[PDB]
Design a protein around this ligand. Structure first.
Ligand code: NA
Length: 152
């Protein structure tokens, strides 16, 4: 099953700066800013398309690993597409979640365009709680980084 949503939002942060913090420096900043996220390490690749990363998260004694694949990256157009999977036992209905992200200049800051694709096991629909939990975590991580840029 394939379930698609789009979100548009703004930032006061200009796109180059927002792209560098979110995507180029995301592996450095995310474990530093999000208590629950222990580490982000390269499993395979050179940081270009096809690169797989392991994100280690701990909450309430419970340690979980989601894998993160780069599908596309282009710094000139602030394009970053990636796929999240793994975390066995964590939210069982998802095979994988594909993000397409793009930033552009608006009024001295950024316009942020996100497209997300939830891939379910075998034609299941997308539960509300799972969509909300994935949206909250990805918005939360991007905003935490966005706030960090504004705080320096
Ligand atoms: Na952390």
């Amino acid at each position: 099953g394939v379930h698609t949503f789009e979100e548009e939002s703004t930032s006061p942060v200009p796109p180059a700066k927002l792209f560098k913090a979110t995507v180029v420096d995301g592996d450095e900043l995310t474990p530093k800013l999000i208590p629950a996220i222990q580490s982000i390490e390269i499993v395979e690749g050179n940081g270009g398309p096809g690169t797989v990363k392991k994100v280690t998260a701990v909450e309430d004694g419970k340690t979980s690993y989601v894998l993160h694949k780069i599908d596309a990256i282009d710094e000139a157009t602030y394009t970053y597409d990636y796929t999240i999977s793994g975390g066995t036992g964590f939210q069982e209905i998802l095979e994988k979640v594909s993000f397409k992200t793009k930033l552009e200049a608006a009024d001295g800051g950024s316009k942020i365009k996100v497209s997300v694709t939830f891939h379910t096991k075998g034609d299941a629909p997308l539960p509300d709680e799972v969509h909300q939990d994935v949206k909250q975590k990805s918005q939360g991580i991007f905003k935490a980084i966005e706030g960090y840029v504004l705080s320096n």
